[PDB]
Design an enzyme around this catalytic site. Structure first.
Site, mmCIF file in Angstrom:
data_model
loop_
_atom_site.group_PDB
_atom_site.id
_atom_site.type_symbol
_atom_site.label_atom_id
_atom_site.label_comp_id
_atom_site.label_asym_id
_atom_site.label_seq_id
_atom_site.Cartn_x
_atom_site.Cartn_y
_atom_site.Cartn_z
ATOM 1 N N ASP A 98 0.762 -1.263 0.000
ATOM 2 C CA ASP A 98 0.000 0.000 0.000
ATOM 3 C C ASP A 98 0.789 1.307 0.000
ATOM 4 O OD1 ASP A 98 -1.456 -2.247 0.684
ATOM 5 O OD2 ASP A 98 -2.697 -1.278 2.197
ATOM 6 N N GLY A 107 -4.279 -4.563 -4.322
ATOM 7 C CA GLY A 107 -5.244 -3.582 -4.766
ATOM 8 C C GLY A 107 -4.564 -2.231 -4.868
ATOM 9 N N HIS A 108 -4.576 -1.671 -6.079
ATOM 10 C CA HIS A 108 -3.945 -0.382 -6.363
ATOM 11 C C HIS A 108 -4.869 0.573 -7.096
ATOM 12 C CE1 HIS A 108 -1.086 -3.638 -6.236
ATOM 13 N NE2 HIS A 108 -1.435 -3.987 -7.463
ATOM 14 N N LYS A 136 2.776 1.340 -5.172
ATOM 15 C CA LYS A 136 3.248 0.613 -6.366
ATOM 16 C C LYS A 136 2.538 0.838 -7.687
ATOM 17 C CE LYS A 136 3.473 -2.278 -3.718
ATOM 18 N NZ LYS A 136 2.913 -3.569 -3.421
ATOM 19 N N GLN A 182 1.795 -6.375 -2.104
ATOM 20 C CA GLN A 182 2.012 -6.348 -0.665
ATOM 21 C C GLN A 182 3.369 -5.635 -0.423
ATOM 22 O OE1 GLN A 182 0.720 -9.983 -1.833
ATOM 23 N NE2 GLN A 182 -1.071 -8.624 -1.783
HETATM 24 N N1 LIG Z 1 -1.863 12.098 -1.707
HETATM 25 C C1 LIG Z 1 -1.270 11.121 -2.393
HETATM 26 N N2 LIG Z 1 -2.001 10.012 -2.785
HETATM 27 C C2 LIG Z 1 -1.222 9.116 -3.482
HETATM 28 C C3 LIG Z 1 0.104 9.249 -3.794
HETATM 29 N N3 LIG Z 1 0.591 8.164 -4.510
HETATM 30 C C4 LIG Z 1 -0.475 7.387 -4.614
HETATM 31 N N4 LIG Z 1 -1.598 7.873 -4.034
HETATM 32 C C5 LIG Z 1 -2.796 7.234 -3.804
HETATM 33 O O1 LIG Z 1 -2.442 6.667 -2.617
HETATM 34 C C6 LIG Z 1 -2.696 5.284 -2.608
HETATM 35 C C7 LIG Z 1 -1.547 4.232 -2.530
HETATM 36 O O2 LIG Z 1 -2.491 3.149 -2.223
HETATM 37 P P1 LIG Z 1 -2.483 1.699 -2.873
HETATM 38 O O3 LIG Z 1 -2.853 1.874 -4.273
HETATM 39 O O4 LIG Z 1 -3.020 0.656 -1.993
HETATM 40 O O5 LIG Z 1 -0.937 1.387 -3.140
HETATM 41 P P2 LIG Z 1 -0.343 0.058 -3.790
HETATM 42 O O6 LIG Z 1 -1.038 -1.136 -3.251
HETATM 43 O O7 LIG Z 1 1.103 0.093 -3.539
HETATM 44 O O8 LIG Z 1 -0.398 0.216 -5.235
HETATM 45 C C8 LIG Z 1 -3.770 5.083 -3.707
HETATM 46 O O9 LIG Z 1 -4.925 5.532 -3.081
HETATM 47 C C9 LIG Z 1 -3.153 6.093 -4.767
HETATM 48 O O10 LIG Z 1 -4.033 6.731 -5.690
HETATM 49 C C10 LIG Z 1 0.798 10.360 -3.402
HETATM 50 O O11 LIG Z 1 1.981 10.519 -3.703
HETATM 51 N N5 LIG Z 1 0.067 11.290 -2.677
HETATM 52 O O1 LIG Z 2 -1.880 -5.858 -0.937
HETATM 53 C C1 LIG Z 2 -1.971 -5.931 0.295
HETATM 54 N N1 LIG Z 2 -1.885 -4.776 1.048
HETATM 55 C C2 LIG Z 2 -1.871 -4.701 2.418
HETATM 56 N N2 LIG Z 2 -1.956 -5.801 3.190
HETATM 57 C C3 LIG Z 2 -2.051 -6.931 2.500
HETATM 58 C C4 LIG Z 2 -2.069 -7.085 1.151
HETATM 59 N N3 LIG Z 2 -2.183 -8.453 0.843
HETATM 60 C C5 LIG Z 2 -2.222 -9.043 1.986
HETATM 61 N N4 LIG Z 2 -2.146 -8.198 3.071
HETATM 62 C C6 LIG Z 2 -2.043 -8.489 4.427
HETATM 63 O O2 LIG Z 2 -1.201 -9.623 4.676
HETATM 64 C C7 LIG Z 2 -1.898 -10.508 5.596
HETATM 65 C C8 LIG Z 2 -2.423 -11.780 4.919
HETATM 66 O O3 LIG Z 2 -3.295 -11.574 3.786
HETATM 67 P P1 LIG Z 2 -3.576 -12.705 2.662
HETATM 68 O O4 LIG Z 2 -2.663 -12.323 1.413
HETATM 69 O O5 LIG Z 2 -4.923 -12.260 2.278
HETATM 70 O O6 LIG Z 2 -3.278 -14.023 3.247
HETATM 71 C C9 LIG Z 2 -3.039 -9.672 6.189
HETATM 72 O O7 LIG Z 2 -2.496 -8.721 7.126
HETATM 73 C C10 LIG Z 2 -3.422 -8.882 4.980
HETATM 74 O O8 LIG Z 2 -4.167 -7.717 5.335
HETATM 75 O O1 LIG Z 3 -4.265 -3.012 -1.480
HETATM 76 C C1 LIG Z 3 -4.548 -3.912 -0.739
HETATM 77 N N1 LIG Z 3 -5.226 -3.650 0.481
HETATM 78 O O2 LIG Z 3 -4.974 -2.391 1.062
HETATM 79 C C2 LIG Z 3 -5.196 -4.746 1.471
HETATM 80 C C3 LIG Z 3 -6.539 -5.081 1.974
HETATM 81 O O3 LIG Z 3 -7.509 -4.368 1.619
HETATM 82 O O4 LIG Z 3 -6.642 -6.043 2.755
HETATM 83 MG MG LIG Z 4 -2.907 -1.693 -2.068
#
Ligand SMILES: Nc1nc2c(ncn2[C@@H]2O[C@H](COP(=O)(O)OP(=O)(O)O)[C@@H](O)[C@H]2O)c(=O)[nH]1
Ligand SMILES: O=c1[nH]cnc2c1ncn2[C@@H]1O[C@H](COP(=O)(O)O)[C@@H](O)[C@H]1O
Ligand SMILES: O=CN(O)CC(=O)O
Ligand SMILES: [Mg+2]
Ligand SMILES: Nc1nc2c(ncn2[C@@H]2O[C@H](COP(=O)(O)OP(=O)(O)O)[C@@H](O)[C@H]2O)c(=O)[nH]1
Ligand SMILES: O=c1[nH]cnc2c1ncn2[C@@H]1O[C@H](COP(=O)(O)O)[C@@H](O)[C@H]1O
Ligand SMILES: O=CN(O)CC(=O)O
Ligand SMILES: [Mg+2]
EC number: 6.3.4.4
Lengths: 431, 431
Positions: free
Chosen positions: A13, A40-41, A16, A224
């Protein structure tokens, strides 16, 4: 470097998606090497947002060939749902996405077990996304699971499936006392798209070897984060795949010697969803404030994320395991308006000892207290800024301090969710 | 290169022990990164023989520090038995061996399950060493297994163990109908050496990072072979760990960018124990002859090994996945007295197609027929020879042909079981 790895230096999170999307502009391929739909991104181009899970974050770029490698436990229902959503939006997924016959298939009973096992744990629950990743990975190692290649012989697939489901139902009802996952439902659902998945099959390992020999820009994309590594994270509060750079070669087929540069996505502060050790976890106004300005909610489960300060001690673990080349500092903008900002520099162990090294298993994180350096914040808005000159000196010193404490330079900096609210001081590809 | 990886380019048993023992002469460390006591190597110094399984093949060398990394599923009973045997022979194991708290523990119920599951498979049995590796790897990914670090809190260890054993017995008796593995026995056995294992604990990842920064010669040692890789081998007739070079970084903690040279142990002909596809498998006098002169019997189960010709098509898979730097051709001496020798160059698929690429899953190996090049053998004895001038031209052309078909040079050549019956044309360390 031609082969560039992009991954999470904390607990997933950190940013990426946006980054792989940004950098894939020069890439021929994009590869996911581990994880599944637990990821999830949120990608955001000119305000329009795209939320991906299983599909690589280069799927919106025409000139790019997305590939989900063998490391990934693939869910037929999942791909299909993400497929239609992108196609309904003009992104011809099947035309740009490739997969590997060796990917293990996540099927219903897997979610059925993940929920069961997660239930049994009661209060010591892991806090899994609930997608069946653990069990799918389990059958994979057990040599009883089904993979994409299995779909080549439908008759046979059905035989294997019938007995794998035989095996799993006996436990579900007799041991956990839950309902059984019906065999025909699973067989039917899957067969309905067997033809779609299989069309997408390519010999991934041999393809990267081919792309390598020609010098094609390949970007590997992680899911992750590091502390979630089944071997090196906060076991057992971890995911079931090697989220670390070692997962690249294992889940792709590219020989490890061809990893050129490793980009570590480093969020400006920390977050974590799921149970597990979290030294710098904030439970105060700042914690609340970070979750707020950072819109911190799982892109997969919608759960609120645990927030806290950047942890240099932990980040330094990420550096050594992944053999980082550089950091991509993200979300610097959320700290705007903060009077002061702290960064964890060392750990104080429950026995009075001061340390710069992270415990391994989660139980070894129990006593642990963070020791910090408290730097001044900044009133200036850094949001969307795309040049350092637009960054107040506070923010600059914070950055510099980070580099000092780690020995790794911040090569890119993100100041907003949109692909373009970013500054590349060095493109991982130009070296 | 400072970090040199040594592994099996076929199906294990190609000659890793002898080689790691030979090359560790300049190494500070030696690391096992995957597998367990399923492995088995015969080292032979001045006629005296040593058979290892779990312990790294540098354990007989004083100047070297052996380390079994996190990738390895460790068996308390097993280490102990190998320990005494080496100590009884003057090799102070505890003084030179290091381990990782993150290694998963193989306990009795694991063998109990492996035997049960292997039974259930009836005729589609995998042909496992019978050591409990699969299930240990299973609990590892499932996040329910116990690791070395768990032994830090004995009370707690006993709690976890009681319920893991709770979980496993319900299946053993109710599902397979086998006898239950008694909890007290397991708890007692283990606690009797908890103190020994734990003494050996070192933070392995941080140690290699430390050794890397100083330029210390580190050799990584693989077990089994490439086609046994859980992701890339002949699934499901494979082992449960990534035997390929990607397992190095995952099971050690060293960042993949620090792999310098990858040495591939290439046996002069092929062997395989356990069920599974084997294109060049010989069932004739030559097959019998190879097994004979090669004393081909598992160093772990004593089982006769399946013998056949060197398979270039398969070896070429090993090249690309491991990012080979060179080959160590072993057992060239066993071919002495052979009128002619063949090497598989391409595959003829069940659909009339000719190919230079290996199928992935085992079922995809079904039709497959080997196409060969039949070179002349040699009357001359090559045994123990330590210079090429002592190798007849036949043998030389065979070698050269091998290189041509693969694109990888033979850097070392072994002509006998003894450490010294060997010729190093290039030391993986001097580049
Ligand atoms: N304010 C802000 N939001 C960002 C930035 N980079 C990404 N985001 C948002 O912040 C979040 C990063 O969350 P997530 O997508 O779970 O990251 P990922 O799982 O690594 O791809 C998403 O809601 C992106 O749209 C940033 O530099 N600043
Ligand atoms: O993409 C991700 N983002 C954040 N936490 C994750 C992600 N995938 C798995 N986790 C965490 O890693 C652990 C196991 O998740 P599982 O992949 O669903 O077995 C739990 O804490 C999940 O919330
Ligand atoms: O991008 C992945 N999530 O933040 C993890 C989750 O929802 O458990
Ligand atoms: Mg994510
Ligand atoms: N004749 C002959 N025997 C060899 C040679 N190299 C090793 N050996 C013996 O051949 C075998 C290789 O078997 P094994 O130890 O299972 O290999 P490992 O599992 O890779 O270490 C052992 O019996 C070694 O002592 C060789 O070059 N020639
Ligand atoms: O060191 C080894 N040498 C040869 N075959 C092995 C070795 N370890 C495992 N195998 C084979 O790999 C398969 C699974 O064994 P397991 O490691 O015992 O699960 C069976 O074919 C085993 O015979
Ligand atoms: O060295 C290991 N053996 O040859 C495998 C076995 O005995 O199963
Ligand atoms: Mg062996």
């Amino acid at each position: 470097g031609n082969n560039v790895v992009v991954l999470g230096t904390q607990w997933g999170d950190e940013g990426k998606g946006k980054i792989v999307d940004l950098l894939t502009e020069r890439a021929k391929y994009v590869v996911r090497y581990q994880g599944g739909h637990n990821a999830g991104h949120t990608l955001v181009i000119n305000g329009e947002k795209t939320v991906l899970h299983l599909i690589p974050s280069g799927i919106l770029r025409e000139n790019v060939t997305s590939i989900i490698g063998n490391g990934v436990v693939l869910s037929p229902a999942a791909l299909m749902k993400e497929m239609k959503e992108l196609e309904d939006r003009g992104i011809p997924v099947r035309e740009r996405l490739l997969l590997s016959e060796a990917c293990p298939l996540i099927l219903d009973y897997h979610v059925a077990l993940d929920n069961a096992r997660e239930k049994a744990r009661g209060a010591k629950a892991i806090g899994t996304t609930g997608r069946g990743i653990g069990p799918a990975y389990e059958d994979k190692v057990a040599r009883r699971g089904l993979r994409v290649g299995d779909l080549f012989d439908k008759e046979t697939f059905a035989e294997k499936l019938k007995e794998v489901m035989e095996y799993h139902n006996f436990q579900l009802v007799n041991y956990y006392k839950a309902e059984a996952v019906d065999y025909q439902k699973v067989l039917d659902d899957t067969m309905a798209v067997a033809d779609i998945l299989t069309s997408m099959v390519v010999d991934v390992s041999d393809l990267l070897d081919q792309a390598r020999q020609r010098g094609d820009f390949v970007m590997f994309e992680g899911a992750q984060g590091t502390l979630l590594d089944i071997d090196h994270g906060t076991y057992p509060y971890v995911t079931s795949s090697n989220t670390t750079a070692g997962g690249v070669a294992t889940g792709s087929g590219l020989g490890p010697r061809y990893v050129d540069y490793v980009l570590g996505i480093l969020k400006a502060y920390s977050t974590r969803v799921g149970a597990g050790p979290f030294p710098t976890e904030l439970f105060d106004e700042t914690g609340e404030f970070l979750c707020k300005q950072g819109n911190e909610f799982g892109a997969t489960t919608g759960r609120r994320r645990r927030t806290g300060w950047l942890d240099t001690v932990a980040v330094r673990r990420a550096v050594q395991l992944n053999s980082l080349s550089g950091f991509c500092l993200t979300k610097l903008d959320v700290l705007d308006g903060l009077k002061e900002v702290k960064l964890c520099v060392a750990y104080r162990m429950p026995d009075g000892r001061e340390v710069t090294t992270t415990p391994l298993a989660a139980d070894d994180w129990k006593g642990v207290e963070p020791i910090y350096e408290t730097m001044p914040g900044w009133s200036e808005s850094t949001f969307g800024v795309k040049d350092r000159s637009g960054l107040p000196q506070a923010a600059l010193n914070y950055i510099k301090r980070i580099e000092e404490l780690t020995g790794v330079p911040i090569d890119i900096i993100s100041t907003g969710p949109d692909r373009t609210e970013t500054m590349i001081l060095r493109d991982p590809f130009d070296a």
